[PDB]
Amino acid sequence: YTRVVWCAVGPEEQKKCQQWSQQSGQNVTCATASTTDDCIVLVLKGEADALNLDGGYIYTAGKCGLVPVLAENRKSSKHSSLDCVLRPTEGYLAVAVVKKANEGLTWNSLKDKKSCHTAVDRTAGWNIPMGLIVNQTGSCAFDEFFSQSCAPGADPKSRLCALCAGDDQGLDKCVPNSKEKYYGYTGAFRCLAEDVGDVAFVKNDTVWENTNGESTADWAKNLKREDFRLLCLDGTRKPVTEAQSCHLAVAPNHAVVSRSDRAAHVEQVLLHQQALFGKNGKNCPDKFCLFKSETKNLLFNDNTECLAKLGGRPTYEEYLGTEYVTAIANLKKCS
């Protein structure tokens, strides 16, 4: 067998990967890049084997030949006798969240407001809301829709990065990795919690996981669910308990990708690594927990229960689903 070389995006993920690599006796080792696209390039060159990706990045990786290997599976809404690794994945709900105190903000009054996005090219933070907005406005000018935004990955001098804050020192503003204070699901929800933006494009779980004491982090520790609303597409506002009926889309779960020729080896190594370090793993919490990172969703989402086998050896188009692939392709016609 061979070692599997994981790709970590940014220095926080690198730190976690190095701990995993130490704990796994170098069965896993780490390459690191500054952005998820750069990690996808390391994997295409064969200088890393694999990483776990949002669906929008699975699209970029899959057009370049990489394939899905195992998917994140979080706690499921319905009981099941099935082992987590054999349970079919239930996507997540992309939502638009605002503060309840920002009265009269709805889907239909988003123009000229301030927005918080996980990063350009991600499912809930960008592809689903910007795809809907281009469609509804009949215009590709999505870069002038919101007055200002934090959309990590966009041009840092542009209005799409004006709300981004970078790192402690204020460097790396708008970079699409965990150093940008408003990156990712928890960064974009923080951008709304702090009232830097009027709306955040995240998923349902983000709201729940960072409110009502679910997070002990300083910016989150006082947030109350009842102070947030979701924006529904018919122009109504609902409590965040109502995401099943007030979402923008259902997104395919994040998943691990690799080159075809290393997919079977990556899959075998990962099933053994989660047996050691996953939820109820032999060495978690004592030694190392692969699906924890103090809410920061480093390498994998912290709500992951396991990585699960995929049905039907799917292509990346089959894993994303034709509807979503066609929505992304439409959106990318713009730029």
């Binding site: 696209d37 996808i40 390039v41 295409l44 970029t60 057009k63 370049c64 030949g65 392709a329 990318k332 016609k333």
Partner: peptide, 6 residues
């Protein structure tokens, strides 16, 4: 619609 971005 078509090729790899890289």
């Amino acid at each position: 619609l078509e090729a790899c971005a890289f």
